[PDB]
Amino acid sequence: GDELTRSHFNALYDTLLESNLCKIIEPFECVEISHISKIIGLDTQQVEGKLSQM
């Protein structure tokens, strides 16, 4: 109902997620998303684009 939040925080949260992912991607690569997916507890696909997005 609050577009601000509705706008800002969502994306804001999403960054945090990345920031988390970013922190999770600190563990080095060639690593299965599902790890992180599992780690973050998110769909790899759901991860992916966002993951990709970065």
Add this chain to the structure above:
Amino acid sequence: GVEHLLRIRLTNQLKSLKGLQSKLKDVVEYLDKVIHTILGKLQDVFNLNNLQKALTVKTNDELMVIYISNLVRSIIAFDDLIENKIQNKKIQEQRVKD
């Protein structure tokens, strides 16, 4: 006053042999001179060669750009002295009025 005296690269190579020449002998010298410690003292640094690594590529990679100036090195030549005689001779070979 020094300056008043005297009056590129191949040299740099030239010593290449020199030490090596003696060196191996210098062993064989001391070898068969005494046939000291310092020789082994040398011996270690020896492997300091065949040392080269695909870091070699860097060289290659580096050497590339080095050459990029090529088309530029003589480009100005390419452009510079060629179109220089065409403005002095046309002026001149045709100067030739009376």
Add this chain to the structure above:
Amino acid sequence: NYEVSEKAFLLTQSKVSIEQRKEAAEFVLAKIKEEEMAPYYKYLCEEYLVNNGQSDLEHDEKSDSLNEWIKFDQELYNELCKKNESKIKELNEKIQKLEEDDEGELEQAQAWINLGEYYAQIGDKDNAEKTLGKSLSKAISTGAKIDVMLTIARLGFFYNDQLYVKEKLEAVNSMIEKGGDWERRNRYKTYYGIHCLAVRNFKEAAKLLVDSLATFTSIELTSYESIATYASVTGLFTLERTDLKSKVIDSPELLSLISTTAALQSISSLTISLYASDYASYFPYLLETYANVLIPCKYLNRHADFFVREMRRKVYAQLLESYKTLSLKSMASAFGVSVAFLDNDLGKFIPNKQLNCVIDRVNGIVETNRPDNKNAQYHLLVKQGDGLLTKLQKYGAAVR
């Protein structure tokens, strides 16, 4: 002129709907009543002629024509000739009185401009120019030169013509670099962003076309949605993620006209929907955009497939850049499309090579390629000098 030339274009494009036909000449059929449009509406009725433009009271009346609105009457002409002559006769002695009294400098050129603008209404690509010339002959103002811009713009863009006008557009803007101070650069870049939009603009004035707005539009030469639409799509289909997601990500400009015209719904809309990195959603959005955008508008149609497959390709870059390792299957299969057919035109991007995509048919898997030291940087180097070297060979090819 604008709707004229477009409702020209529209029906001259009539493919999808009889309305594409209908709606267009509908007005025109009244607009030829509005203005005495015959002399080009004459050839305009030969414009779409030999397709469906084949039904006319003067030129051709044919059943294969789905448009009969490409019809005339000589009354139109009599009306016209009257109107015209009326117009003519009016300005004649008027301009002649402008000549007689030595009356005004631009005020002389004024009724000239009036003389000219008839030909805009008339669909005469003639005296108006000479009139403009003899307007411009009377032009003491770059504002009359501005009117040259207008004129030449009304000239070419009444037919949506090309170069001379653009050239004039240059020539007219070449005189004083002012650009109507802030503006006529607009008209310049506008029409330029249309000129170059023939058929291209592609990178070129697409930006420019995107850039200034709405700082003019023209009526008879354009509407504002027009540039917006046009500016968007090309600049869109051309420019960067960043740029677009810097700019068409949105503009108050956009925010104003977003879906205001629905005359878009798609352009970056479905493209940022694409730029959301979709697969399937955008896959219709294309043609959804296309037939709603491309076929509709002059250059938007005329260019056609420039657009089509690049964004098609484009996303794959994203899709690649996501994945070193992407299963094309996971792509083409798991994207719920023709694998192969998708893959085929996708494979038609192997020779277009803009794929770094390293891609399977069998295992249906996609991989990447990368500039590395090669780049184009240490890559392009070869030819660049070569061409010079040629010119350098050419250089020495002089000697004597």
Add this chain to the structure above:
Amino acid sequence: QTNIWEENWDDVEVDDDFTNELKAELDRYKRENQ
């Protein structure tokens, strides 16, 4: 061929977009079949 087009590559080819849309239906329709 006319005067000045966008020029090269070359005209390439045509009858794709709809052919695609046909499949943009079909592919998706196939995906609707899916």
